[PDB]
Subunit: 327 residues, 4 copies
């Protein structure tokens, strides 16, 4: 009903505007796209090859080498066979790439031309080294790492061991593991405090076992996360009828160090009130066979009805028992 | 008796099937094997060397260079000494590798041939830089890092300071340390909830001191991890006789940042009910000598009997004391 | 009034003096500046090019090559066309850069000159590889990573849900996320213990929800951090009048793994007593539009008065209620 | 009196013996020393240069090139100017280094020689790329990172705010910070359990505030860590007289992500019973000046006597107060 803060794929639906502007290289490197970075580097080569080509051409002109490029017994050029700009350009390329076919070749005659080969060589090494580093930076820090973690499409409400629970499923799409993996959840909705303060989107924890460490999971086969709805839950007063009427969002988070990518990851998804299925339970995916366990991921998102599920809130379930005792 | 979820070496015994298919480069790089990646790169060289060889050969043909490859006073080729495809191929290799022996050598005559050396040079740099990056990616992120952490073959049950305890041993195989190292444990077995829900493999925490921080260890010499079996333990009602009858698995985990590999690691092992030795204790490994401590790792896995160990459950041990008090 | 320990931008205002001096390469590499490192490497090239140039020149001299550099039917030089130091220098450059124009060229004659090309080649590879590594080290580990996290200029005191609270705002300047993000706060001031010990700057925790996990945040749009001022707070006895009189500093911290830079970050700021605005509340920044949320960052630092805010301390607010009950 | 488990500099004093032997490349790379790795790579160059030199020499021999190395109108060699092994060797070096002076130069004649240049080029790229990677691996993961964290030489016992405390000092030797920094401590000594089990070195936590988060520190200027000695402390029954008699070791740990090195670090030190100074307090190091704070690190390790410090244990201090109340 209201706008969705976090999309089902984890993407946050929030635009930032009217920010402040401040006056690093590593961040700049990984942002720019491939085709743009490769054009940039090929530009850096052209510019250096033209710059030095022009300088060697000038040196040829002033020395009189364009009139006698091969030299003779009386005359030795600065750089053999520089007879024009194209030849000067070729010698620059040949020097910096270090192809050096050698028909065009520097001589001992001109200390400036010697100096210029010394400088071009060093500039060449620098440009190359930066290209290798920029390529590794972008190679090592991509921005489209395909998600390795999966949330179910729906959450459910149902009874487990005498308690009304909100439940969602998480699974790992690879055979590699998640180290120090742990889960969180939040109820997102606006509210006004008793002092009349408006909070556009207040985020209220959904307890999944933090205080006894049980928020920490060892995720091999898909696990079902449990939030007991009790006094302290923000869903304590919500019945099945309140659900289809209500307008709120539950954000769910899984965090951990993913072996596959060697980086700490935050996977996300969202459940609107209208995506929570009261009186449902998830289809098992894990089955034992021969000498090995197996997970059929088709049943990952699938649920089934439990009609014996109470339709009243957890508060009502509690307050019924205290009355069914007095009289 | 039932299938083993996690093998003694940490390997999880679970196959994934019937997954969903989605439409990164860094993950692709580290997966592919050495011999396959090196063939792939040598293929990328061949392809680029043949591509450009063919292009330079075409340019020679159309220019009439194959009939006069050395040139003369009236005729200058695009690229000296390209007299066939093999020569064209050699010039391509020489240019991109930047060997450039120079017998075959580009001239000033043909702006397209000049352009093609410019392009081949840049393509060469790109291919090389990618090869360096791909080699480092795979070098820095291997998938056969020999385990540096060791679990004992067996767990044991025995008394320590008046309490019946489940115990397993962990040790570090190197002189380098594990930063922020800490342990976990779980009882793995299927169960049906009171509402008739089947959980194929429910994972139930085994308390090793999380709530007072004592799950955190400083692991120099092998340490023995302790799980007090009390009210809250899932082994509270299990006696020595129940053990040899029962069918369950205890997964044990050690996590931390390993100095040796500079990465957060999750070491794993498993104990089936039949691998837990009731009434046993581990052989010490740590002995003081001269001015230095020493660990003999032969006694790591070794145990010895304690016949004074009660054979009844922890519940029975408790319920006996309350009765031996009333009368 | 007293000196500020931590500046508003996070910078700590503390100088270290009279330290102890101890007798790594990776830290040395990232510290040195760009222009200084590039001069250092260009120096390393010059030195190696001159060293070997000199060695090849010596070999030429002793062999008699300077008198017959081209050689003939009876005489073969160690290295063709080394007719002086400049030629020797050029051959050294050409060999190590591997330009190798080849007019100057090593021969089969002198095993020492052959040995020296072998050594120079290897030295060349080593120098190059170090340059690539040093450039990546500095590229990957910069010291001017523009802050991606923002604190408000002021903290405020105001009522929320019946409780007097210290509040500051934190926001994320990028669309990328912060993994395992969490907050801390501290009151910094000197004190003397009852035993007469002076602590120049004692750091006293400001509780922002650590014991129930609520110090952990999922930071998409700017969040307001809450410190309930109660019995256990160090601001329990401080009223609005005490604030404008008092002299203390509150340091605020946000920590987490920042996706943008792939590194664990500690963002910092500070609030002097005189920067805390009693009886104020922050301007909302988050507004719903069309099918998307939006953050206007101009209102980030902006506040508004709440005159219904009590001006007495939290202790006074408490002690009033116990009296307004007895009589 | 007994052997010291952890040295004052953090080094653990434990040898491992009689370990099990198992049948990665990245770990192998960072272990080997510089001079040994550089010899290894220079060996890899020699071997490849000799291998291919020999192959090109064979090709010359069988083709009859050693009798006519320059060729003529009727005869074209496989590789020009290969007149012996030294020339063959030179051509191999020139090809793989890609110096390619070009006097020695491959021709179009022999498909095997062409094939061999193709193979040598690729082998060259591979060897080079591995050298760059191995150099970065060792560059990025050194084993002599100079410690950036300092512990005091002594711990002390003294009163703070009505409580008998064990105290040690920690300081940061750089202006860069430690992210998510936190402390631990342990009492190390052997003991026998009531069931007669010997634990060579039992490690018993020393509480420094874990349960309220106060083990976490923001370390700018040197901080003094506090362990309140109470009921739950293992130093509860230890008086000043017991200290000079006792034989135990307290290990102290500081962990966190160090900005300077971009890695999670564990700093260590130790205090033997004989290094704990009862009735002492640390010299302040932090002083306010002008508009800036300053730390004089000379007073870091320095202490001063407090003769008003009780000489009895914390148990005695407690049990005195309950008696001084009854009568
Ligand atoms: K070359
Ligand atoms: K050449
Ligand atoms: K080259
Ligand atoms: K060349
Ligand atoms: K040449």
């Amino acid at each position: 009903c209201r706008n969705r803060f976090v999309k089902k794929n984890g993407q946050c639906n929030v635009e930032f505007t009217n920010m402040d502007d401040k006056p690093d290289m590593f961040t700049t490197c990984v942002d720019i796209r491939w085709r743009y970075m490769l054009l940039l580097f090929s530009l850096a080569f052209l510019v250096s090859w033209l710059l030095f080509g022009l300088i060697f051409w000038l040196i040829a002109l002033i020395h009189g080498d364009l009139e006698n490029p091969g030299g003779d017994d009386t005359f030795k050029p600065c750089v053999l066979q520089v007879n024009g700009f194209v030849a000067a350009f070729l010698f620059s390329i040949e020097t910096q790439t270090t192809i050096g076919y050698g028909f065009r070749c520097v001589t001992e005659e001109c200390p400036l031309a010697v100096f210029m080969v010394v400088v071009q060589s060093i500039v060449g090494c620098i440009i190359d080294s930066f290209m290798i580093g920029a390529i590794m930076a972008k190679m090592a820090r991509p921005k489209k790492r395909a998600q390795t973690l999966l949330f179910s499409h729906n959450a459910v409400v149902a009874m487990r061991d005498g308690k009304l629970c909100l439940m969602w499923r998480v699974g790992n799409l690879r055979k590699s593991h998640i180290v120090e993996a742990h889960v969180r959840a939040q109820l997102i909705k606006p509210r006004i405090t008793e002092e009349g303060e408006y909070i556009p989107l207040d985020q209220i924890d959904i307890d999944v076992g933090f205080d006894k460490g049980l928020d920490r999971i060892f995720l091999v086969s898909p696990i079902t996360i449990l939030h007991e709805i009790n006094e302290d839950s923000p869903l304590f007063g919500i019945s099945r009828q309140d659900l289809e009427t209500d307008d709120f969002e539950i954000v769910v988070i899984l965090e951990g160090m993913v072996e596959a990518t060697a980086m700490t990851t935050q996977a996300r998804s969202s459940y609107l009130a209208s995506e929570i299925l009261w009186g449902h339970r998830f289809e098992p995916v894990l089955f034992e066979e021969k000498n090995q366990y197996k997970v059929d991921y088709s049943h990952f998102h699938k649920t089934y009805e439990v009609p014996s599920t109470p339709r009243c809130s957890a508060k009502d379930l509690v307050e019924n028992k205290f009355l069914l005792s007095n009289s």
